[PDB]
Design a protein around this nucleic acid. Structure first.
Ligand SMILES: [Zn+2]
Ligand SMILES: [Zn+2]
Ligand SMILES: [Zn+2]
Ligand SMILES: [Zn+2]
Lengths: 195, 195, 195, 195
DNA sequence: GGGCGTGCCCGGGCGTGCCC
DNA sequence: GGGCGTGCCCGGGCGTGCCC
């Protein structure tokens, strides 16, 4: 009961995610729709669009949390490796958190008091007049390969729309690989998929 | 009267088990429907799905217990071998218990006061809206071959749906082999079966 | 400095070891001169002859100690596995000791206060008028394969002739394998040697 | 002035090092005379022989210290990476130290008060009558590749014979690679050398 | 962008107590 | 005495940050 659900849930507000088109072997961030997987470099900007069919009420929040994808590792909390944990904080993000948000004055970093899982939360803001969507800029602060952290294990990022009390309004998820060469690794994984 | 029943019993709630599809000679966990037998590596995650036709009431519990499959050994309590008993506790599991549950804050480990058999219990949780089933992650903390423990003897795991008082609501079981090479050993035992 | 020397040392008294001729796949004990290696079954009698060119003085003692043969394991104390440690004492031998002596009223079992290594000691007795030699009956109380004990690692037995203070008068050694089928395993290891 | 000398110096006592012959792709430890380089697995035993032409006086000590081989990295202290630092102490070795000695009751672990470099020291012991030499068992507690530690950089181990005050009596050194497959990597580096 | 690292995954096959 | 177990040794080969 300590691993959060990843089940997609558009909910009453029609909550969906969108991703940008990207460029290179070493592109900073690129999303594979075939794999529903984001490939990015350590600490680079990963834009994620939030789409809704209708505006949720005031006090709605947007939470991001990583979990390991594989059954064998689901119950292990995703955290930064010891090496990077001792390195690059912005004053708000605790050094142990993998996922950060940039460019948001109201960001909150949470350590669940029962599961000890990390997450990062911002208020939901509606798009400008109109718009079609709102964009959050996430950063992942370890490579998937980091020894003593993710240790080459795939993760999912779970994005939830929640009320102020943490009740679920919507949920979406995508896989992530943080690596040196996102364009190479996207092409490799897509070719293995179509094989 | 000191060996528990293994008789299948879907009961009033239509209680059934499901297992995941698995990958390798040394896959960490794989289930053989032909043998109704789980093959897994020591301490690796063994996901088991709980299916019900209708939700049981609050206070319902899910218990797992191991017994030796063969008549000659049924009356012997299944325990960890002395070597592994002295090794890896998570703070909750007594070191003598073969079966653990991972990722559940409400787990209880029991030593029957009359039979001295071990079991591990968690509360039953209904699936998310939606979902079709609930999944528990079990771990087996000795190999089937462990000298002074299972000593190469096959075991059954008995999963029971129970009320708070221990009254039976449903029961299912499967055989287990804990070994270094679950893929090899599943294939070997399936080939011997079809011979 | 915590691993004892195995260097052969006949010393002033011309101290040498002798071994009996043996019979079968599952002979209880058999010695390979080609390998300088004793093969025996768990807890069976292993006769070792003590030869001297001249009688050492009163108070001389005979000590036996096991060490792992391989550099990678030399610094680990040789002990019985947890399973057998909890099983068969004769009233004198501590349950953790691998090597016992049978049929000697003056046997002593020692745990070194600095290295924690085990040994077993008897007084040296001269041969009868015649013889030509004196024989000690040793027992090894785990198989080489025992999990959590020797764990398939080869050992040496070091036999030392010592004065009452532990000063060295002579030293000899031989390799040991404790196993179910000493005759099979001797033939296998001798054939691998001559290959 | 904060990087120690590696210059060979047999000194008045004719101090030299010797290495054992080794076996496999994944042999636990193997020494390349062509490269004057030790290849070993993390935490496995690395035997090093100490040879002298004459016995040094009482109070003589043997120190081992690691430095980075390349000019670009020489001035950086060699330490364990953060991941392994937080893992496996024997009660004596500080968790930050790369080099340990096993099986010696008089080992000392030092952090230089001026350079902050680590070293491990044992008393010099003369060979037995027999023997020709004395052997020390070293362990290296990180892989050469460890992120945040050696980070794929080659190191030298410097072994010094010293009086009680730290004055130099003799010095020798060898390169070290700690890796998963010492046999493979020795063969690879020897082939590159002869190219 | 091409290509070398290097811990670890992968299947082949040898152990070794015990069944026959 | 013949022969099957079964954890682990063995070499082949894929990773993936970083050198070129
Ligand atoms: Zn990291
Ligand atoms: Zn066990
Ligand atoms: Zn034993
Ligand atoms: Zn390390």
């Amino acid at each position: 009961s300590s691993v959060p659900s990843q089940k997609t849930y558009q909910g009453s507000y029609g909550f969906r995610l969108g991703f940008l088109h990207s460029g290179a072997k070493s592109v900073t961030c690129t999303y594979s729709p075939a794999l529903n997987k984001m490939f990015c470099q350590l600490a680079k900007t990963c834009p994620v669009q939030l789409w809704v069919d209708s505006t949720p009420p005031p006090g709605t929040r947007v939470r991001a949390m990583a979990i390991y994808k594989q059954s064998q590792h689901m119950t292990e909390v995703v955290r930064r490796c010891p090496h990077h944990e001792r390195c690059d904080s912005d004053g708000l993000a605790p050094p142990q958190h993998l996922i950060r948000v940039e460019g948001n004055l109201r960001v909150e970093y949470l350590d669940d008091r029962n599961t000890f899982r990390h997450s990062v939360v911002v208020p939901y803001e509606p798009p400008e007049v109109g718009s079609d969507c709102t964009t959050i800029h996430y950063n992942y602060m370890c490579n998937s390969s980091c020894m003593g952290g993710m240790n080459r294990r795939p993760i999912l990022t779970i994005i939830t729309l929640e009320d102020s009390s943490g009740n679920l309004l919507g949920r979406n998820s995508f896989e992530v690989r943080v690596c040196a060469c996102p364009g190479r690794d996207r092409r490799t994984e897509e070719e293995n998929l179509r094989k």
